[PDB]
Write an enzyme that holds these catalytic residues in place. Structure first.
Site, PDB file in Angstrom:
ATOM      1  N   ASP A  74     -12.010  -3.139   5.038  1.00  0.00           N
ATOM      2  CA  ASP A  74     -11.716  -2.083   3.956  1.00  0.00           C
ATOM      3  C   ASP A  74     -12.100  -2.762   2.341  1.00  0.00           C
ATOM      4  OD1 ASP A  74      -9.569  -4.082   2.816  1.00  0.00           O
ATOM      5  OD2 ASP A  74      -8.479  -2.003   2.360  1.00  0.00           O
ATOM      6  N   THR A 103      -5.771   5.513  -3.829  1.00  0.00           N
ATOM      7  CA  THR A 103      -5.320   6.804  -3.669  1.00  0.00           C
ATOM      8  C   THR A 103      -4.122   6.496  -4.281  1.00  0.00           C
ATOM      9  OG1 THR A 103      -4.268   5.675  -1.475  1.00  0.00           O
ATOM     10  CG2 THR A 103      -6.207   6.897  -1.734  1.00  0.00           C
ATOM     11  N   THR A 104      -3.638   5.867  -4.664  1.00  0.00           N
ATOM     12  CA  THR A 104      -2.611   5.097  -5.642  1.00  0.00           C
ATOM     13  C   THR A 104      -2.530   5.864  -7.263  1.00  0.00           C
ATOM     14  OG1 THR A 104      -2.772   3.394  -6.409  1.00  0.00           O
ATOM     15  CG2 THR A 104      -1.252   3.335  -4.437  1.00  0.00           C
ATOM     16  N   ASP A 161       0.838  -1.309   0.057  1.00  0.00           N
ATOM     17  CA  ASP A 161      -0.764   0.070   0.070  1.00  0.00           C
ATOM     18  C   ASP A 161       1.028   0.791   0.100  1.00  0.00           C
ATOM     19  OD1 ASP A 161      -1.641   2.220   0.489  1.00  0.00           O
ATOM     20  OD2 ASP A 161      -2.964   0.668   1.612  1.00  0.00           O
TER      21      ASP A 161
END
Length: 505
Positions: free
Chosen positions: A369, A76-77, A43
């Site tokens: 998540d 988010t990446t 991550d």
């Protein structure tokens, strides 16, 4: 001197370190601090949150990234790679004597225009169809990094999120616990329609199963009690000490009688049961435990609907809980308590198993998540394909619209559309395949009347239908990520001067 030229380059360094991490097979480089603790995580948020920086403007791109992690939990990446391109393509315009006020106007207009195009590209599905629901479950577990086991695991997720859908249609993350415990293999996983606790009875003479459990919730620790008024106990005669040890125990037997008389077949006490006390609750047929964590006592209050009591001397019929079954069993190892309530449950639990404390925590962190991404998907009801497929389609839509708008701002709208072409490029180079030769074929499929759901498969390595393989993500991760990109890059383009900030509270 240039000042602004130093910020455009700094954004590329922070983005380059988290560029190859995109996709399932995303490799990561080591960056251990001066201490020595080696940390290996795929991550990107784990690195950006702990990695240090050197320039002050580097925090502008990290600030907007933290707010994005607390809303979807994934993608988010992809929001960082899109910023490096829009920040790099600007250099080509500045060389042509273009003012920064012109390039910032194209991104805002192009970003807002995409808000209406994604609505038409998105499909429509139901909020209770279990058929399509299972297809989204396997797509989430595979996106993390656990393809060896995903058949039965996908069925445990669809039944947990679907079994906690309120009337208004809102998913609650607090109603989904995760219990970690090694076992024989990971395949030995199963859900429970209630709660779970990792405790064992104090004595082997207590019952093993009982119907219509009337749990007595307690909210007190283990410690010598004292009346609200100041008072202390005194002892001096050793021989008389035997009179108090039996007197105090007598005050407990008659006290539990009032609890049992009010219908309390079971009892989940929160104190150290005396050596002799275990003999009374055992013969009478009342389970019990010694020393339980407060985290397990707070969920039973709202789950069973019991009332929190603080005085053990006031436990009438209207001061007790209720549960379904409380059978004692094992699961390849110890024998814990399994409290259930099939009459009116309110939460579910999961006892993911494995072989080591390291492999069970990894999957346990990527499941909390996953349900969050699929949870909000059912609330909205609209889903759109992803994985670089739709990114190639949006380019053709923006180019046709760029021809309509006139003026000097017609160059920024073209770079913004072409900036999104790096998504399939990174995925192509990830699998060791050429990109300049593959990007020419993916566009041929989307010539005109072609299927909009089509992309490159990382496994086979060729253009296929994403609807058949398994590459679909909700539109909330794209509409919010692209919106935060234009709002974050504008902070470095508008500023055209530095300041000697010193002593500012």
């Amino acid at each position: 001197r240039d000042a602004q030229r130093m910020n455009i380059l700094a954004g590329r360094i922070i983005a380059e370190t988290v560029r190859s991490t995109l996709g399932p097979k995303g490799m990561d480089k080591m960056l251990v601090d001066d201490l020595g603790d080696v940390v290996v995580t795929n991550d990107g948020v784990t690195i950006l949150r702990e990695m240090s920086v050197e320039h002050p403007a580097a925090k502008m791109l990290i600030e907007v990234a933290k707010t994005q992690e607390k809303e979807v939990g994934d993608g988010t990446t992809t929001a960082v790679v899109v910023a490096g391109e829009l920040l790099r393509k600007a250099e080509e315009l500045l060389d042509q004597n273009v003012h920064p006020t012109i390039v910032v106007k194209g991104y805002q207009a192009a970003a807002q225009k995409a808000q209406e195009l994604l609505k038409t590209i998105a499909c429509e599905v139901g909020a209770q169809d279990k058929e399509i629901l299972t297809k989204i479950a396997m797509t989430s577990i595979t996106g993390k990094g656990a393809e060896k086991a995903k058949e039965k695991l996908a069925e445990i997720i669809v039944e947990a999120v679907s079994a906690v859908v309120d009337d208004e249609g809102k998913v609650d993350k607090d109603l989904i616990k995760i219990e970690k415990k090694s076992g024989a293999s990971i395949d030995d996983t199963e859900l429970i329609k209630g709660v779970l606790v990792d405790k064992e009875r104090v004595s082997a003479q207590m019952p093993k199963k009982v119907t219509d459990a009337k749990i007595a919730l307690l909210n007190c620790a283990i410690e010598i009690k004292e009346t609200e008024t100041d008072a202390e106990i005194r002892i001096t005669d050793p021989a008389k000490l035997m009179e108090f040890i039996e007197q105090e125990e007598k005050m407990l037997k008659d006290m539990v009688a009032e609890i049992k008389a009010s219908g309390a077949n079971v009892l989940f006490c929160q104190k150290g049961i005396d050596d002799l006390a275990q003999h009374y609750l055992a013969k009478e047929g009342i389970v019990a435990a010694r020393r339980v964590k407060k985290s397990d006592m707070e969920k039973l209050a709202k789950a069973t609907g019991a009332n929190v009591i603080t005085n053990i001397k006031d436990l009438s019929a209207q001061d007790l809980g209720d549960a379904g079954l409380v059978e004692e069993r094992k699961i390849s190892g110890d024998s814990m308590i399994f409290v259930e309530e099939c009459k009116h449950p309110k939460a579910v639990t999961m006892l993911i198993r494995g072989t080591t404390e390291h492999v069970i925590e990894e999957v346990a962190r990527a499941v909390d998540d996953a349900v969050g991404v699929v949870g909000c998907t059912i609330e909205d009801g609209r889903i759109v394909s992803g994985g670089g497929s739709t990114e190639v389609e949006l380019s053709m839509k923006l180019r046709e619209y760029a021809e309509g708008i006139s003026g000097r701002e017609q160059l920024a709208v073209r770079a913004f559309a072409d900036a999104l072409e790096v998504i399939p490029r990174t995925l192509a180079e990830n699998a060791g395949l050429d990109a300049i030769e593959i990007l020419v074929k993916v566009r041929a499929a989307h010539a005109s009347n072609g299927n909009k759901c089509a992309g490159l498969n990382v496994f086979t390595g060729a253009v296929e239908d994403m609807c058949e393989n398994g590459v679909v993500e909700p539109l909330r991760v794209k509409t919010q990520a692209i919106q935060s990109a234009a709002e974050s890059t504008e902070m470095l383009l508008r500023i055209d001067d530095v300041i000697a900030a010193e002593k500012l509270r």
